[PDB]
Structure formats: C-alpha cells, structure tokens
Design an enzyme around this catalytic site. Structure first.
Site, PDB file in Angstrom:
ATOM      1  N   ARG A  87       0.820  -1.210   0.000  1.00  0.00           N
ATOM      2  CA  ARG A  87       0.000   0.000   0.000  1.00  0.00           C
ATOM      3  C   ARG A  87       0.839   1.238   0.000  1.00  0.00           C
ATOM      4  O   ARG A  87       0.842   2.044   0.962  1.00  0.00           O
ATOM      5  CB  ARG A  87      -1.101  -0.019   1.074  1.00  0.00           C
ATOM      6  N   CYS A 122      -1.761 -19.943  -3.503  1.00  0.00           N
ATOM      7  CA  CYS A 122      -1.305 -19.522  -2.143  1.00  0.00           C
ATOM      8  C   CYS A 122      -1.274 -20.730  -1.190  1.00  0.00           C
ATOM      9  O   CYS A 122      -2.261 -21.361  -0.951  1.00  0.00           O
ATOM     10  CB  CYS A 122      -2.062 -18.364  -1.540  1.00  0.00           C
ATOM     11  N   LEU A 123      -0.086 -20.907  -0.687  1.00  0.00           N
ATOM     12  CA  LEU A 123       0.516 -21.833   0.225  1.00  0.00           C
ATOM     13  C   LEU A 123       0.011 -21.666   1.681  1.00  0.00           C
ATOM     14  O   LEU A 123      -0.037 -22.696   2.337  1.00  0.00           O
ATOM     15  CB  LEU A 123       2.059 -21.577   0.329  1.00  0.00           C
ATOM     16  N   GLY A 124      -0.165 -20.425   2.095  1.00  0.00           N
ATOM     17  CA  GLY A 124      -0.677 -20.141   3.422  1.00  0.00           C
ATOM     18  C   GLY A 124      -2.210 -20.108   3.446  1.00  0.00           C
ATOM     19  O   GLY A 124      -2.861 -19.557   4.370  1.00  0.00           O
ATOM     20  N   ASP A 135       0.260  -9.000   6.182  1.00  0.00           N
ATOM     21  CA  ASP A 135      -0.558  -8.144   5.334  1.00  0.00           C
ATOM     22  C   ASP A 135      -1.834  -8.580   4.763  1.00  0.00           C
ATOM     23  O   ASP A 135      -2.763  -7.731   4.681  1.00  0.00           O
ATOM     24  CB  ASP A 135       0.307  -7.126   4.649  1.00  0.00           C
ATOM     25  N   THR A 136      -1.945  -9.796   4.253  1.00  0.00           N
ATOM     26  CA  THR A 136      -3.217 -10.320   3.805  1.00  0.00           C
ATOM     27  C   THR A 136      -4.187 -10.636   4.946  1.00  0.00           C
ATOM     28  O   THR A 136      -5.221  -9.883   5.041  1.00  0.00           O
ATOM     29  CB  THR A 136      -3.120 -11.505   2.784  1.00  0.00           C
TER      30      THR A 136
HETATM   31  C1  HEM Z   1      -5.848 -13.314   3.855  1.00  0.00           C
HETATM   32  C2  HEM Z   1      -5.410 -14.471   3.311  1.00  0.00           C
HETATM   33  C3  HEM Z   1      -4.469 -14.450   2.083  1.00  0.00           C
HETATM   34  C4  HEM Z   1      -4.685 -14.003   0.861  1.00  0.00           C
HETATM   35  C5  HEM Z   1      -5.967 -13.399   0.260  1.00  0.00           C
HETATM   36  C6  HEM Z   1      -3.478 -14.175   0.101  1.00  0.00           C
HETATM   37  C7  HEM Z   1      -3.307 -13.901  -1.278  1.00  0.00           C
HETATM   38  C8  HEM Z   1      -2.323 -14.500  -2.080  1.00  0.00           C
HETATM   39  C9  HEM Z   1      -2.378 -14.620  -3.526  1.00  0.00           C
HETATM   40  C10 HEM Z   1      -3.457 -13.976  -4.396  1.00  0.00           C
HETATM   41  C11 HEM Z   1      -1.287 -15.313  -3.895  1.00  0.00           C
HETATM   42  C12 HEM Z   1      -0.759 -15.674  -5.288  1.00  0.00           C
HETATM   43  C13 HEM Z   1       0.455 -14.922  -5.844  1.00  0.00           C
HETATM   44  C14 HEM Z   1       0.418 -14.769  -7.345  1.00  0.00           C
HETATM   45  O1  HEM Z   1      -0.191 -15.648  -8.005  1.00  0.00           O
HETATM   46  O2  HEM Z   1       0.962 -13.739  -7.815  1.00  0.00           O
HETATM   47  C15 HEM Z   1      -0.565 -15.678  -2.706  1.00  0.00           C
HETATM   48  C16 HEM Z   1       0.589 -16.428  -2.672  1.00  0.00           C
HETATM   49  C17 HEM Z   1       1.411 -16.602  -1.574  1.00  0.00           C
HETATM   50  N1  HEM Z   1       1.039 -16.246  -0.290  1.00  0.00           N
HETATM   51 FE1  HEM Z   1      -0.844 -15.761   0.279  1.00  0.00          FE
HETATM   52  N2  HEM Z   1      -2.478 -14.734   0.901  1.00  0.00           N
HETATM   53  C18 HEM Z   1      -3.084 -14.883   2.132  1.00  0.00           C
HETATM   54  C19 HEM Z   1      -2.367 -15.355   3.236  1.00  0.00           C
HETATM   55  C20 HEM Z   1      -1.023 -15.724   3.287  1.00  0.00           C
HETATM   56  C21 HEM Z   1      -0.312 -16.186   4.455  1.00  0.00           C
HETATM   57  C22 HEM Z   1      -0.959 -16.312   5.837  1.00  0.00           C
HETATM   58  C23 HEM Z   1       0.919 -16.527   4.056  1.00  0.00           C
HETATM   59  C24 HEM Z   1       2.097 -17.080   4.923  1.00  0.00           C
HETATM   60  C25 HEM Z   1       2.761 -16.147   5.676  1.00  0.00           C
HETATM   61  C26 HEM Z   1       1.024 -16.247   2.639  1.00  0.00           C
HETATM   62  C27 HEM Z   1       2.148 -16.442   1.880  1.00  0.00           C
HETATM   63  C28 HEM Z   1       2.090 -16.632   0.517  1.00  0.00           C
HETATM   64  C29 HEM Z   1       3.150 -17.205  -0.311  1.00  0.00           C
HETATM   65  C30 HEM Z   1       4.487 -17.737   0.245  1.00  0.00           C
HETATM   66  C31 HEM Z   1       2.721 -17.204  -1.572  1.00  0.00           C
HETATM   67  C32 HEM Z   1       3.424 -17.689  -2.834  1.00  0.00           C
HETATM   68  C33 HEM Z   1       3.372 -19.112  -3.369  1.00  0.00           C
HETATM   69  C34 HEM Z   1       4.065 -19.298  -4.721  1.00  0.00           C
HETATM   70  O3  HEM Z   1       4.544 -18.247  -5.263  1.00  0.00           O
HETATM   71  O4  HEM Z   1       4.078 -20.507  -5.172  1.00  0.00           O
HETATM   72  N3  HEM Z   1      -0.193 -15.812   2.176  1.00  0.00           N
HETATM   73  N4  HEM Z   1      -1.231 -15.204  -1.592  1.00  0.00           N
HETATM   74  C1  LIG Z   2       1.893  -9.111  -2.087  1.00  0.00           C
HETATM   75  C2  LIG Z   2       0.751  -9.621  -3.041  1.00  0.00           C
HETATM   76  C3  LIG Z   2      -0.207 -10.602  -2.265  1.00  0.00           C
HETATM   77  C4  LIG Z   2       0.578 -11.831  -1.723  1.00  0.00           C
HETATM   78  C5  LIG Z   2       1.727 -11.346  -0.759  1.00  0.00           C
HETATM   79  C6  LIG Z   2       2.682 -10.360  -1.520  1.00  0.00           C
HETATM   80  C7  LIG Z   2       3.303 -11.125  -2.760  1.00  0.00           C
HETATM   81  C8  LIG Z   2       2.206 -11.663  -3.741  1.00  0.00           C
HETATM   82  C9  LIG Z   2       1.401 -10.397  -4.254  1.00  0.00           C
HETATM   83  C10 LIG Z   2       1.227 -12.611  -2.958  1.00  0.00           C
END
Ligand code: HEM
Ligand SMILES: C1C2CC3CC1CC(C2)C3
EC number: 1.14.15.1
Length: 405
Positions: A177, A348-350, A242-243
């Site tokens: 942001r 997304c892994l988390g 952040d998410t």
């Molecule tokens: C509010 C819940 C969440 C939302 C809406 C969210 C959203 C996203 C999205 C949209 C992506 C895909 C990235 C892409 O395709 O460009 C992503 C990937 C990822 N997020 Fe989440 N996220 C959330 C929670 C988290 C949490 C809790 C973690 C762990 C600290 C996390 C870590 C990651 C990681 C490591 C990836 C990348 C996986 C890869 O590149 O194969 N996220 N997230």
């Molecule tokens: C910012 C956006 C959402 C999540 C966390 C961080 C990297 C990628 C784009 C996945």
C-alpha cells in the site's frame, strides 16, 4: 498523471483505472474495482495510470492468464514496473519448473501439517484477545485484534521479536500500500537490512522456527543460498502481516452491519466454513499481475512483449458470469467461485493458515460478542493497493450482552 498511449493500444480499449486510488473508494474498495465489470467496460482494457498497463477484468481471463505461465511470467508481477522488477521474493517472482523446488520448501514451513501443530495456540490467542476486549464494549478492530491476532502467530512461527512488529509492518505496508514515503526498492532494502543478520544466525545455529528451516533448506540437491533465503523469508513476512490482517477487518465490518449474518452463524455453526468461503469470494483483496515474455494475442487483443497485465484476484468472484448477485453475501450459495488464493502454479501456500485463522475468529467472536456494531458516526475508509484494506474499524457493544466462556 497519465502516460502517452503506446502504439499498439486501440484507444477504444482505454479505460483509465487507478489501482492506487479507484474513484468510488468512498462507496467501498471491492465496489470501487467492480466498475471494471460494468457493461460499458471491455473484458480486457488498458489503463494509462501507474505508467500504462493492461488489466484483465473477468473471471475467465485471469484464470487463463494465470495458467499460461509462458507468455504471462511472474518475472515482474507488480505494477508499476520498477517495483515489479525491484521485487525478488521467491517463489513469487519465478515461473516453473524453477519454482516447484522453492515452493516445496515454503510449503514445508507454513503448510497443512504445520497448521495442525499450531491450532491450539491459535484458539488460545483467539480467546485470550477477545476476552480482554469484551468488557470494554469498544475496540479499534484494526489495531485491536486485526493487527495483533495474525502477527503474533507469525512471530510465533518465525521465532522473531514482537518488538519488531511495528517496523516490519510499516515496511510490509509501504510494499503493498504505497504511501509515497518510500519506494518499493527502498522498502525491500530495509526489510532486508533486518532479516539478513537473522538468516546469518540461523545458518550457524539452527532452530525449529520457519526461518530456521528456510536458512537450512534443501533446493535441487544443493543447500539453499543465503540470498534465496533472505528472499523466501521476505515473502513470508509480507504475506504474513498483510493479507490476513486486512481481510479480517472487511469480514468484520461486514458482520458489524448484518445482524442476520451474525445470527445465522451463531445458530447453525455447521455453516462457518461455507460462510468462510463466501466471505473470501466477497471481501477478496489482492491485485498483482504478470509480464508478457513475448508478443501474443489474447482474446483478440494484440499483446506486446514487455507489457504488464494486472490480473486482480479480487475480480474473479465479483463477476456475474461467475457468481449470481456478486455483491450479496449468501452463506448458502451452491458454488462459491473465487480466486482469492490466486490460481495457477502460484496458488497460495498459506491458504491453510489464513482459512484456519478466519474460522477461529468467527467462531470465537460470535461466542463472546454475539452483537456489536459500528461506532455511531464513524465513517470507515478503505484503501486500494496490491492488497486492499481498512483504515481503522471502531466498534461498539453492550457488555451486558456479551458472555465470557
Ligand atoms: C488473507 C489471506 C491471504 C490471501 C488473500 C493471500 C493472497 C495471495 C495470492 C493472491 C497469492 C498468489 C500470488 C500470485 O499468483 O501472484 C498468494 C501467494 C502466496 N502467499 Fe498468500 N495470501 C493470504 C495469506 C497468506 C499467508 C498467511 C501466508 C504465509 C505467511 C502467505 C504467503 C504466501 C506465499 C508464500 C505465496 C506464494 C506461493 C508461490 O509463489 O508458489 N499468504 N497469496
Ligand atoms: C503481495 C501480493 C499478495 C501476496 C503477498 C505479496 C506477494 C504476492 C502479491 C502474494
């Protein structure tokens, strides 16, 4: 402050949308973005702001662009360009087959089986924070539960100091942001001046924490680099803080407003999970893109190698051709179609941690504070960015009506 239309763009494909300040923000951020789906908007359109870039607007393109890693690469996934480019988080800025290995490691740290391990601390904290809040009959949901809840779990995960919180967070925030206080590359740096010394220390003398596995991680027969580590742990920080933080505030502002939604969850808990999915479809919030490795023609638009394309994961579930009555919350839809957890090799892994943190908070807050609402005369403000949010969410309640458990 728009940039000249590039040669290849048919000016009828223009539609000046500003991801960092959509028009109708006052009416709400998902509503802000949902303009892109009015009848008057092309499926694929080009915006001149944030230096000109495509934005794909419908469920089906995004899904298609996401599965097509070839012409649509992660190399530079952040608009504007400089950030996207200056962004090097793994596995994010990487297409497969490279990715497969960095991802499998990250999955080690945050995955399913890590989630069962943590459940109890989650619930333990969920209860503890709520019960503290209970008797005051007023919190600041964003600072009061939203910020605290998820962070402390990640700090628990990664074995890092709470004290660190407020700093990494500002850094996380500038990243998703952008205020204008600090540019992405500067942002990425200080987050790195931080982690670095930490990664050093976990290389030499390991721990059980997420970071300890990460510094000592195995990638394609060899031992992970220091940089690849710095870089994995970077992504966890931001996805970490952040998410989940932001999503909770929209879901909660939603509940503060719709007493039939609190009621329904409260009487038929067999519905939290469904309710859970429906809320993610609706209070969706991420919006990154990809990059065109080459010239390509996608649904008749000539895409030119080098151009960026936003593929808002927000939009997929708010799309009528996908979800009847998109802007309306119904815990009993037949099919909840969304892509909040992204889609493609970069799913997304988390998703497990995030989902698990979201059910805990709904089940637990409804248990103690069945009935709350927005502070008379407070105007909630959202924020649009790579990840959208709530400025603050003042709530109010009647102690007399709560229950300790
Ligand atoms: C509010 C819940 C969440 C939302 C809406 C969210 C959203 C996203 C999205 C949209 C992506 C895909 C990235 C892409 O395709 O460009 C992503 C990937 C990822 N997020 Fe989440 N996220 C959330 C929670 C988290 C949490 C809790 C973690 C762990 C600290 C996390 C870590 C990651 C990681 C490591 C990836 C990348 C996986 C890869 O590149 O194969 N996220 N997230
Ligand atoms: C910012 C956006 C959402 C999540 C966390 C961080 C990297 C990628 C784009 C996945």
């Amino acid at each position: 402050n728009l940039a000249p239309l590039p040669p290849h763009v048919p000016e009828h494909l223009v539609f000046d949308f500003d991801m960092y300040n959509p028009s109708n923000l006052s009416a709400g951020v998902q509503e802000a973005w949902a303009v892109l789906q009015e009848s008057n908007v092309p499926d694929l359109v080009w915006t001149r702001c944030n230096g000109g870039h495509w934005i794909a607007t419908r469920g089906q393109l995004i899904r298609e662009a996401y599965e097509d890693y070839r012409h649509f690469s992660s190399e530079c996934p952040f608009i504007p360009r400089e950030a996207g480019e200056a962004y090097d988080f793994i596995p994010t800025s990487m297409d497969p087959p490279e990715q497969r290995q960095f991802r499998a490691l990250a999955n080690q740290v945050v995955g399913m089986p890590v989630v069962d391990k943590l459940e109890n601390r989650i619930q333990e904290l969920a209860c503890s924070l709520i019960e503290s809040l209970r008797p005051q009959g007023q919190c600041n949901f964003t600072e009061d539960y939203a910020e605290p809840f998820p962070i402390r779990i990640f700090m628990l995960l990664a074995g890092l100091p709470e004290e660190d919180i407020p700093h990494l967070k500002y850094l996380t925030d500038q990243m998703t942001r952008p205020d204008g206080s600090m540019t992405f590359a500067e942002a990425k740096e200080a987050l790195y001046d931080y982690l670095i010394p930490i990664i050093e220390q976990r290389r030499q003398k390991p721990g059980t924490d997420a970071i300890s596995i990460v510094a000592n991680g195995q990638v394609n027969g060899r031992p992970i680099t220091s940089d690849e580590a710095k870089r994995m742990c970077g992504l966890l920080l931001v996805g970490g803080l952040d998410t989940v933080v932001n999503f909770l505030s929209f879901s909660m502002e939603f509940l503060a407003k719709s007493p039939e939604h609190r009621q329904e969850l409260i009487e038929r808990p067999e519905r939290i999970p469904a309710a859970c999915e429906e809320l993610l479809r609706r209070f969706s919030l991420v919006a990154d893109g990809r990059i065109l490795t080459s010239d390509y023609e996608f649904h008749g638009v000539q895409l030119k190698k080098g151009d960026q394309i936003l593929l808002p994961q927000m939009l997929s579930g708010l799309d009528e051709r996908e979800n009847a009555c998109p802007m309306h919350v119904d815990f009993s839809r037949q099919k909840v179609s969304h892509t909040t957890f992204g889609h493609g090799s970069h799913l997304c892994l988390g998703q497990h941690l995030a989902r698990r943190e979201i059910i805990v908070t709904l089940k637990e807050w409804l248990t103690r504070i069945p009935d709350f609402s927005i502070a008379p005369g407070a105007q909630i403000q959202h924020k649009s960015g790579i990840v959208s949010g709530v400025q603050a969410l003042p709530l109010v309640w009647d102690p007399a009506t709560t229950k300790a458990v």
